[PDB]
Amino acid sequence: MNFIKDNSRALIQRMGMTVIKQITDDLFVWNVLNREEVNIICCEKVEQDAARGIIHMILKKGSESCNLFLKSLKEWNYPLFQDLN
Amino acid sequence: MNFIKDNSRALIQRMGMTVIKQITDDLFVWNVLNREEVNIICCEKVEQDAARGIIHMILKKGSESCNLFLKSLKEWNYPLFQDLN
Amino acid sequence: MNFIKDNSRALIQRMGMTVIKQITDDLFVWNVLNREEVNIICCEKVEQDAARGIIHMILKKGSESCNLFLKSLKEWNYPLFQDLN
Amino acid sequence: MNFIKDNSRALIQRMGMTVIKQITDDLFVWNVLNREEVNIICCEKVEQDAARGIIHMILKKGSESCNLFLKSLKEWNYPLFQDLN
Amino acid sequence: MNFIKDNSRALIQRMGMTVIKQITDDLFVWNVLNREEVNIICCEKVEQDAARGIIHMILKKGSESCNLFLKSLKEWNYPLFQDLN
Amino acid sequence: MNFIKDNSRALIQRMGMTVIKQITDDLFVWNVLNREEVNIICCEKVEQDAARGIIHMILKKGSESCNLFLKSLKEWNYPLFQDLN
Amino acid sequence: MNFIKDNSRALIQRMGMTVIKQITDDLFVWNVLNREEVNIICCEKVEQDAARGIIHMILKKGSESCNLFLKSLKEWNYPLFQDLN
Amino acid sequence: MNFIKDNSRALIQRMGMTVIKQITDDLFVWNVLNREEVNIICCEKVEQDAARGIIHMILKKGSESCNLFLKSLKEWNYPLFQDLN
Amino acid sequence: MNFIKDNSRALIQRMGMTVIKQITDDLFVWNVLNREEVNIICCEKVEQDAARGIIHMILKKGSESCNLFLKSLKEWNYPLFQDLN
Amino acid sequence: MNFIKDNSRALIQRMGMTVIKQITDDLFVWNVLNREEVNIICCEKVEQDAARGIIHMILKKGSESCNLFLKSLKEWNYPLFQDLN
Amino acid sequence: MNFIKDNSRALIQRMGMTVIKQITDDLFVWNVLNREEVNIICCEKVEQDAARGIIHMILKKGSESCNLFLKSLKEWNYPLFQDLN
Amino acid sequence: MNFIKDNSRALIQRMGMTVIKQITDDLFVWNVLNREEVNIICCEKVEQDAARGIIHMILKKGSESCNLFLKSLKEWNYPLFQDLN
């Protein structure tokens, strides 16, 4: 998805860890990620690094995994998604 | 197997180390690889190089070792395998 | 011991760090490991990597070091050992 | 660009990793670098080595890629760029 | 092809190994090179020597193999190809 | 032995250096080779050349030295030996 | 065979050593050459000299040995053989 | 010493780097090795290669240097030495 | 200094990282080390490796740099220095 | 310069890679070395070999290039230069 | 040209291979040398021998080919050319 | 000197390259060898060949050059020299 690439400069800045901890779960429910990638992402200290791991690990998993991330991104932390349009 | 050769341009890009660490184990269980090749593959830094070592070391071990790699590739990181068809 | 090899696919998944921190000590008491290997294993972040280091470092120390690991594995975290049979 | 060459003695000293992690992203957005060079640069330990890789990999990519690096260097870590003139 | 010959003074200087590792793959997919030439080229240390081996091994394989190299050179490391015109 | 000659086209292709490093040792234990031939074989870069040196240096040492090579070849890297029959 | 004679001006130029190392093997399997001629050809430095020795040593061994050389030349380094027609 | 030669098949497999890092020091104290050989051995990645360098560099330094290696081998990693008898 | 060499077997074991972090600073104040060596030593995980880097980097800087290290070693972590005599 | 020749026995021993990485840069700024010699020197593993390459490549570039090396050697790692007088 | 003859005692000593690898290329661009002479010169081990081949093969190719060699010698490795006047 | 001749059977076996790299330097300091012989000896792969070149090149340079070689042989790698008496 181009929408993630073009705004990934701002996505690694104003996202927040507290919403990452939820997006990773909603992704784990839909059988996109296994447990090891959650244990690797969720253990980092600075949330910007987790943003790097998630953004870089979703652009690798085709384009169908982008839509799920976008819905799970507009459910939690909606003001950012509405602000970015 | 032709399926690996024809898609090996994309397999060395969107694979990921975290799933390689499991594929190498599932291969080690079935007596395909010995320990030294695991110690050689698992010590590299960039995951693309590990993808090169695995892809280049499976095309050498006949064609029966391809099917096991394909099963262990469709168990972990299924969205890539489903996307590639 | 074959019992570790045949189930090492599941041992690197459902083990847990909190029991590794005890198994390493019970091994350190019986003069199997020295301190440097404990400092190397206990400093890793993801517990699966510690499981890899322990499982790969016990299959190297003969077969007598397997029984001690099995006893220290059935004392703490007994439901896993009972479930695996 | 001569400005980078003449001050590259000081650019590999007072730069810092935390700003490199942003410069690499702002470069990745503008289709200058691909992902593999980011995975190679961002994995090094000492920030001076990352400064060597970036400075040596930009002087090779013509002169138009120097101006973008200079803008992305004057946005983040402005006091260094203002101090160097 | 004359375009490679006339600019091969600059192609062995500002190319980089990280893009060679991809060009060799995209060439290996199209049945141009076999595995042994990849094992000979990819094992050299200084990237300039790999540039010598590739540039000297493509001018020998007719002119039809030049176009594929040029496309695979404008996909990865595009700023160099655009700068060289 | 005819079995080595008739399949030596495929033995110099799908063998691998990592198993050569063990076969040379298992040969060195049984007083077949001295150290200088190990220092000559183990220093080459491309594994195919080491395959040439070993295959060409065993057909010279009678036929009794073939059986040891075959056993040491079916212990490590068994899938190749089983595939070749 | 006239096809080798008429194009031997270009065969001693764009052939390459890396394919000679395979053609000599595929010839040695079919009991065409003995080992001493392989030890004579494979020890030369410039690949053009090996091309001279091989091309001059095949035109002497009748015409039936030309067809095998042509097949082994169209298996490895096919783009040259297809380009030369 | 024959004891090292006859069991060097197993010594290059189940030794481990973590004990090599200590054996090299205990050897460096007794003026057996100088610093350059320590810098050559300690920089390798796979521990099996370090085992090769140490085992091959001790069989060259007479037989008196074997006893020190055996004592320093039975102090650290004692279960291996006791298992090997 | 001979005192460091003769006890370097025990200095790389019972030293500790928490005192290394202070010795490196007290050395940096007296213009013995520059910043890059501090960034190289302080980034290692196991404290024994830092002990190796410091002990091996002081025996290279003459003998006058030994006395400062000994004073800075008897200020912090005094019981070890008093125990070693 | 005689001062380098007469002390080159000790300069290839107690120098260190960490200061070589800076001397090569300060030399690269003053248009003494080009990039290829830096890529050749900086890629070696053991620092003693880099000391050999630098010391042997400076005694070839006249005597005016010795003074610059001496200044850049007395700026970083001053205690060695002061100890050697 | 007399300038090469009178100083060829010093040109075969302080030149270096790393600059020869570039001078041969800059000569190959201007249609002075063909590929076979580059394959003959570039394959020698000691750089002094390459200096002998180049210096002896340029004094044979008239005097117009000397000026190009002098320019390509003053572009790379300038301190030698400036020192020799 | 007879001592070198009578033990040169064992000197070409248990010497090692790592000490040759120092003996050649200590010889170069005392104006015994020039640089070209160092470039000839130090470029060989198998250390036994370097032992052949050094041992055969010292028996030619009178007998006074033997004592220097013997001292430089008893400084580095002392256990061999003490074992050989």
Author numbering:
A (entry chain E), B (entry chain D), C (entry chain K), D (entry chain A), E (entry chain B), F (entry chain H), ...: 1 to 85
What does the study report here?
Many NLR proteins nucleate the “inflammasome”—a large macromolecular complex that triggers inflammatory cell death and cytokine secretion in response to microbial or danger-associated ligands. Like many other supramolecular assemblies in the human innate immune system, the inflammasome complex relies on homotypic and heterotypic interactions between the death domains (DDs) to initiate, amplify, and propagate pyroptotic signaling. Inflammasome sensor NLRs can be grouped into two categories based on their DDs: PYRIN domain (PYD) and caspase activation and recruitment domain (CARD), both domains were found to form filamentous complexes to initiate the inflammasome formation. Extending this analysis, we also found that specific type II interface motifs directly dictate the compatibility of heterotypic pairwise CARD-CARD interactions among NLRP1, CARD8, NLRC4, ASC, and CASP1.
To extend these results beyond NLRP1 and CARD8 and test the predictive power of our model, we examined a third CARD-containing NLR sensor, NLRC4. To unambiguously assign the Type II interface residues of human NLRC4-CARD, we determined its filament structure at 3.3 Å using cryo-EM. The final polished structure closely agrees with previously published findings. Interestingly, unlike NLRP1-CARD and CARD8-CARD, the strong density bridge in the Type II interface is absent within NLRC4-CARD filaments. The Type IIb tyrosine residue (Tyr78) is folded backward toward the hydrophobic core and does not participate in intermolecular Type II interaction. Instead, two nearby small residues, Asn77 and Gln82, come forward to form a class of Type II junction that is more flexible than that of NLRP1 and CARD8. Molecular docking predicted that NLRC4 Type IIb surface would be structurally compatible with both ASC-CARD and CASP1-CARD. This was validated using the in vitro EMSA assay (lanes 6–7 in both panels) and in 293 T cells. Overexpressed NLRC4-CARD nucleated the formation of both ASC-GFP and CASP1 C285G-GFP specks, as well as ASC-CARD-GFP and CASP1-CARD-GFP filaments at similar levels. The versatility of human NLRC4-CARD is in agreement with previous studies on murine Nlrc4.
